[PDB]
Structures are given as C-alpha cells and as structure tokens.
Structure 1
Amino acid sequence: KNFSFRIDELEEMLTNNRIWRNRTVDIGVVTAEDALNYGFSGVMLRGSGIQWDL
C-alpha cells in the first residue's frame, strides 16, 4: 500500500532530470536483431522494442 509513493519519489529525482537524461539517453543502444542474435533476454529485448515476456 505504501510503496508506490517510494517509486514516485525515486522518479522525481531521475525521470525528468536533465543530468540523468544526458547520462542515460542514447547510451548503449542495441538493435532488436542484434539483441536476438546476441541472446539477450528480458529488459534488454523490451528496451530494444521486442514484445516478449515469458
């Protein structure tokens, strides 16, 4: 019951922070075909845009 507020506070410090976005945006971009061939799974695929979840 009390955990969504913790996630919200975590997002208040990072999600729209311009320093966080400069550090994380367009860093370590992996294409979907490369992810599948390299054998990535989970959030790696889903960040590349692959609609897969066991």
Structure 2
Amino acid sequence: LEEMLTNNRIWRNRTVDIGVVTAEDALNYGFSGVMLRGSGIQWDLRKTQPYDVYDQVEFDVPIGSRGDCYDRYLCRVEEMRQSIRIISQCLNKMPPGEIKVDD
C-alpha cells in the first residue's frame, strides 16, 4: 500500500495543507486521536495512563510536525506497523493462566 500511495503526486497533491490545526486549538476543540498525534502536542493514553498489561509491551507512537492532514495519514500507517509489533510481542508473552476471573 505504501508504494500504492505516498509519493503519488495525485493523492498527495490533493491532500497536503488542507485542513491544518493549531495544537492549542485542537485542545480547546477537544480532539483526541490521530489528530493530536499528527499535529504536535505529543500525547497518548496508552503511554500515560496504562489501563491493563498493555503497559508492558514495547512500541513507539508516531507524530508529525506539519499538522497537515498528510501527517495524520502517515501516523495512522505507522500505528498499523506498531500494531504489528504489539501483536508480535503479545504472541511471545502469552501466559497460560485462565480466562475469566475466579469469583
């Protein structure tokens, strides 16, 4: 897919500067997601407030400095790749404990 796109003059030149966002503006409008990712303002819930063993596994989140809606695309991509990392390590770490709680 990354050869299917990403240096395509068409897709790029259609989405480059369209719909940018200022970081603080995104904060006031409350955007949470690939928005904040691709536009500055480095933040994640996965990293900051781990809600389960998802804390342990290693991986790294992308960002972008152009806030350009192209950055957000590429950030989604790289999150797919990192998702592959997390899936891998998860397959390596799986304990054979049990399914449901015992209560």
TM-score bucket (shorter structure): 0.7 to 0.9
Ranges of 4+ aligned residues in structure 1 off by more than 6 Å: none
Cα shift readout 1:10-45 (whole Å, capped 9, x = no counterpart): 110111111111111001101101100000001001
Structure 1 or 2: more helix by fraction: 1
CA RMSD of aligned residues (A): 0.8
Provide the C-alpha distance between the structure 2 equivalents of 1:38 and 1:14, rounded to a whole number of angstroms.
30
Normalising by the residue count of structure 1, what TM-score does the alignment of the two structures yield? 0.76
Normalising by the residue count of structure 2, what TM-score does the alignment of the two structures yield? 0.42
- Kindly name which structure, 1 or 2, has the bigger radius of gyration based on alpha carbons: 2
Structure 2: 5+ residue runs without aligned partners? Answer: 46-103
Query: How many residues were matched structurally?
Result: 45
Structure 1: 5+ residue runs without aligned partners? Answer: 1-9
Structure number with the bigger relative contact order (C-alpha 8 A, sep ≥ 6) is 2
